[PDB]
Amino acid sequence: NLYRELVDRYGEYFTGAMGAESIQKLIENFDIDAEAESLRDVIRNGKGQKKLRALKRLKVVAAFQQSGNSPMGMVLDAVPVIPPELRPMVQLDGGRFATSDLNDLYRRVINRNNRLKRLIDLGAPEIIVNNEKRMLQESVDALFDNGRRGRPVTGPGNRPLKSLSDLLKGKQGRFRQNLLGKRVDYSGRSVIVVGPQL
Amino acid sequence: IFKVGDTVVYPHHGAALVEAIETRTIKGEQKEYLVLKVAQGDLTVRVPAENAEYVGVRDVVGQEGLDKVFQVLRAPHTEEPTNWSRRYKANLEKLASGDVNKVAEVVRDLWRRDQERGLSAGEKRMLAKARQILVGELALAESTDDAKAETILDEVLAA
């Protein structure tokens, strides 16, 4: 209500926003060099836990500043789709198709996206469009990393659906399971017995 | 109200048989529950004699009602608009009312419209159910070989 008062009285000459678009706008109208110089000044004249916080934030910002990678790539306008064979859809048993979980997450993102596009086109009160944007946000979060925020999106059986990040963490991830050790052809095994004449 | 073994009409269920009136002294008063049985699944109902007429305890109509409903189902020209919702709700209400004339009118209308085109899935089930209850009460009133009852019902309805 205070926001509504402030805008409807003095909406002009100051810009307010909500959500990821607001954060993207905030990043755009911001100079990395100014923040880096300020951090350098504070550490030049800081002390204590203020010093430590300055050091950490300076690391974070100088990561972007020293390199040519700008931070605008943190906020996403388009999301990539892993190819199909890494996202199987194959029939099995009695011809019953058995896809993976990424299809559900991608489908949820797509559903939210189409609904949001339509809604904006028709023109709806800010409440519903905010709700749809929030849905898209939490769904992209589940897609990229399920369980990291909100609730673990659980498919049937209350099982948390595997997300793209999950294919990295832990043993079952790609790294520890199919790169640092792989099944091999031209191989076998059997039980062993003492061969003293050998 | 009724003695033992009487035939009773308890809508929307229709025909039923009474066996006794057990007076359940529950609530400090012997509730003369007329124990009643139906044919669908042998369900048992205990109807207070104090309010038996209130809940719909009654008798099958005499032959005067039979001829009245014959005339009702003989009458053509019952119109209807293009939609479906109006008749669906109307026949729902008039079948839940436990009446003989209106159930006959609606079942006649639905029969003729089915014979014309064929309407839907569940309305065929309602048509069947209405025909079954009408045949049951006809056999109850006449005691006329309920298979014969449905045959004659079809014969007069076709006209």
Partner: protein, 245 residues
């Protein structure tokens, strides 16, 4: 204790919390909004149609029209804005009802909040085509349109395998008949019972059942299934081409 102040200051402080549950959050987003009055809704609709006619009249007279008076232009722009805000307020009042009727298809297929938003769209269409000339309750007319929209969206977005809407209809019909037939007889109904029930040859029920099947996520446990899912001919083809050589 109402104006106990402290007792309402606690409520205000509790209103400003983080809260992460989106269903609870939206429960409170419509929390701020209230209900509506039937006659008030009639006047709301009247204002909506008036502002609509005003904006279309602007658009028509925008081409080779007239230089409208400042007062006339101001008032008609205000009527149009009033109509927009009127429909926003009306939708805000109806969010509660649509949520209350959308809670009845939860636990299946898709997210409850997803059901909510599809129902909200159905509500927008309902107000888009609401007729108050007879002057009846808005909600009773609306329920049909919201249910239409949510059933459509459920059908279009139910399964990973896309099936046409007609097939969604025949499948949920098959399921309902199956359920009630079991409830009555207690024996598994044979496919021929369904075939004669719908008056079809003894194949449609089989195809519809096969379509009705839900895909099984390759992720499973007992270990996921995806691991366990499946050079003579390649070597042979190279060799045969050489043999032709």
């Amino acid at each position: 204790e109402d104006e106990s102040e402290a007792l309402r200051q606690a409520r205000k402080d509790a209103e400003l919390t983080a809260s992460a549950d989106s269903v609870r959050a939206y429960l409170k987003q419509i929390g701020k909004v209230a209900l509506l009055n039937a006659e008030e809704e009639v006047e709301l609709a009247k204002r909506i149609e008036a502002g609509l006619y005003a904006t279309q009249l602007m658009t028509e007279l925008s081409e080779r029209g007239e230089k409208l008076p400042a007062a006339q232009r101001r008032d008609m722009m205000w009527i149009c804005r009033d109509g927009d805000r009127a429909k926003n307020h009306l939708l805000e009042a109806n969010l509660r009802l649509v949520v209350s009727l959308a809670k009845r298809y939860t636990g299946r297929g898709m997210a409850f909040l997803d059901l909510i938003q599809e129902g909200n769209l159905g509500l927008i269409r309902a107000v888009e085509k609401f007729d108050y000339t007879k002057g009846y309750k808005f909600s009773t007319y609306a329920t049909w349109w919201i249910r239409q929209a949510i059933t459509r969206a459920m059908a279009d977005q139910a399964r990973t395998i896309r099936i046409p809407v007609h097939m969604v209809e025949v499948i949920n019909k098959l399921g309902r008949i199956q359920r009630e037939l079991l409830q009555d007889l207690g024996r598994e109904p044979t496919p021929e019972e369904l075939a004669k029930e719908m008056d079809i040859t003894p194949e449609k029920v089989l195809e519809i059942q096969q379509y009705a099947r839900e895909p099984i996520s390759l992720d499973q446990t007992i270990s996921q299934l995806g691991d366990f899912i499946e050079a003579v001919d390649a070597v042979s083809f190279t060799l045969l081409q050489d043999q032709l050589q």
